[PDB]
Ligand binder design. Structure first.
Ligand SMILES: CC1=C[C@H]2Cc3[nH]c(=O)ccc3[C@]3(C1)NCCC[C@H]23
Ligand SMILES: *[C@@H]1O[C@H](CO)[C@@H](O)[C@H](O)[C@H]1NC(C)=O
Ligand SMILES: *[C@@H]1O[C@H](CO)[C@@H](O)[C@H](O)[C@H]1NC(C)=O
Length: 529
């Protein structure tokens, strides 16, 4: 039977699922590690003990314990990202969608969710791999990993809460896939990891980390880069945040062992309740528990690794959306609201600048402000709103990604860059938010192919184009159909393409004007001052 698979960890039984008037197999909730509960909380994941009998892989697993967004109760726009299954620390499972009939050795894609390392679920409707698996005939895997303090509390030096364990969870799932995907018809030597936002930064981190490199072949990064300003902290800052968390739960802070023991005696929600209290500055696009530059998972600083070519050399496909910053300004910056056009005053603009570059001194805040203000029309509310949107997106996603792509391309074996700028016709978020962070995902996963979802014919065609670009690249290292063009991104030309419903257009030097400011000038200014 097609729904029965014997793996090295034991036998699993899947389920048939309908998709676009057809069907494929799905093995949901396959465990890849021992439950990270009790004394195991904060510890590195342990490989799953093989089992006898048949594991029921017919239903989605629990979602990891995480902060739940209740900023707009009942609103589909935000609810679609919240956990849609019971939360539990016993959450280390993966999902696999397999074409029917079962392939023998086909292209494999592994998805990594990316809610800023503090949230995300492999079970969201927007992450349903059945459309992509089916349409492109690939074996689609979505993994899970601990988020928040559970996945990233870091007390460097202790073996109890070393930090980066959520990245280790990802690595274990990649290892399981590498070891067992052949049994589901996938080619373990042709695995492409892909992810968005923190998932995109994660993908880059596995490209960098020596211990993760051999577990996959190619990589796709969507609106996320490993060098993003919010994607990691130093060992010292990580330690400070762990101590501060303990201080918030009235923990004994006499030793690491004292602190860790206390944190393990707290219920999941108690940790989540005070998680946002440990940030060092009032800021946006900053998350509490993220990867730590530790000397193990990351041998040296990211920049020196990038500079010396110390990373997996292969092909990558990546890009960004037009208005990456809007979501974060909506959730926090003074002046933005979901139901108004959010025209911004000069004063709120400046408050926004400060929330956006929290580490900067006044001179630095002045430099940014100068750079993004139209001094002829400095009180124009629309311009202030849009400039702030660009500041957030440029600083947090685009420029860090452009720096990564340029550093990578000097040593890689092929780069393909895109700029996604199509606003979905059925978007429930206000128009001022534009092409929002995370909204290219639904096209990558092919939801536009589903009639009831209300997309236009043009949108369905865009989704098919994107899915085929992603799948062809995963299979060959080139998104273009041989003898059927998305140009290769090179150090010299630096070409990229737009992804929308209009005829493809090739461009060059994506936001180079602003990224020279964020990647070369500002860092220099903050270091001199
Ligand atoms: C940090 C973050 C980054 C984006 C990616 C993401 N991914 C998730 O899985 C859950 C929430 C989210 C986010 C939170 N909130 C919903 C809109 C997308 C963004
Ligand atoms: C688990 O598998 C059994 C069959 O062995 C099935 O009846 C059940 O519905 C599955 N999941 C549930 C509902 O707990
Ligand atoms: C990738 O590597 C192969 C051989 O190692 C080489 O022939 C090819 O030119 C490289 N491609 C790129 C885009 O660098």
């Amino acid at each position: 039977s097609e729904l029965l698979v014997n793996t090295k960890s034991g036998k699993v039984m899947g389920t048939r699922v309908p998709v676009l008037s057809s069907h494929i197999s799905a093995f949901l909730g396959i465990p890849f590690a021992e439950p990270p509960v009790g004394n195991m909380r904060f510890r590195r994941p342990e490989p799953k003990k093989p089992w006898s009998g048949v594991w029921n892989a017919s239903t989605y697993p629990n979602n990891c314990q995480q902060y739940v967004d209740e900023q707009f109760p009942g609103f589909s726009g935000s609810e679609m990202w919240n956990p849609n299954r019971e939360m539990s620390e016993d959450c280390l499972y993966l999902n696999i969608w397999v074409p029917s009939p079962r392939p023998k050795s086909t292209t494999v894609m592994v998805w990594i969710y990316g809610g800023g390392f503090y949230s995300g679920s492999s079970t969201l409707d927007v992450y349903n791999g059945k459309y992509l698996a089916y349409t492109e005939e690939v074996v689609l895997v979505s993994l899970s990993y601990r988020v928040g303090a559970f996945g990233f509390l870091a007390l460097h030096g202790s073996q109890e809460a070393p930090g980066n364990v959520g990245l280790l969870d990802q690595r274990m799932a990649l290892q399981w896939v590498h070891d067992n995907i052949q049994f589901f018809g996938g080619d373990p030597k042709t695995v492409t990891i892909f992810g968005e936002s923190a998932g995109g930064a994660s993908v880059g981190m596995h490209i960098l980390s020596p211990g993760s490199r051999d577990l996959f072949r190619r990589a796709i990064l969507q609106s996320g880069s490993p060098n993003c300003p919010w994607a990691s902290v130093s060992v010292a800052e990580g330690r400070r945040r762990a101590v501060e968390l303990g201080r918030n739960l009235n923990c004994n802070l006499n030793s690491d062992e004292e602190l860790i023991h206390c944190l393990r005696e707290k219920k999941p929600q108690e940790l989540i309740d005070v998680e946002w209290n440990v940030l060092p500055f009032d800021s946006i696009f900053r998350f509490s528990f993220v990867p730590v530059i530790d000397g193990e998972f990351f041998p040296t600083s990211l920049e020196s690794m990038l500079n010396s070519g110390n990373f997996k050399k292969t092909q990558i496909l990546l890009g960004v959306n037009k208005d990456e910053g809007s979501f974060f300004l909506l959730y926090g910056a003074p002046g933005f609201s979901k139901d108004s056009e959010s025209k911004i005053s000069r004063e709120d603009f400046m408050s926004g600048v400060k929330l956006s570059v929290p580490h900067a001194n006044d001179l630095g805040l002045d430099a940014v402000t100068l750079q993004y203000t139209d001094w002829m029309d400095d009180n124009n509310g629309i311009k202030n709103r849009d400039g702030l949107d660009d500041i957030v997106g440029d600083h947090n996603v685009i420029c860090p990604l452009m720096h990564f792509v340029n550093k990578y391309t000097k040593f890689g074996n092929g780069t393909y860059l895109y700029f996604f700028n199509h606003r979905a016709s059925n978007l429930v978020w206000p128009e001022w938010m534009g092409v929002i962070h995370g909204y290219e995902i639904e096209f990558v996963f092919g939801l536009p192919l589903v009639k009831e979802l209300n997309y236009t014919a043009e949108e369905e065609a865009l989704s098919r184009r994107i899915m085929h670009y992603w799948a062809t690249f995963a299979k060959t290292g080139n998104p273009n159909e041989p003898h059927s063009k998305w140009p290769l991104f090179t150090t010299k030309e630096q070409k990229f393409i737009d992804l929308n419903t209009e005829p493809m257009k090739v461009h060059q030097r994506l936001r180079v004007q602003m990224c020279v400011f964020w990647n070369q000038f500002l860092p220099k200014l903050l270091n001199a001052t």
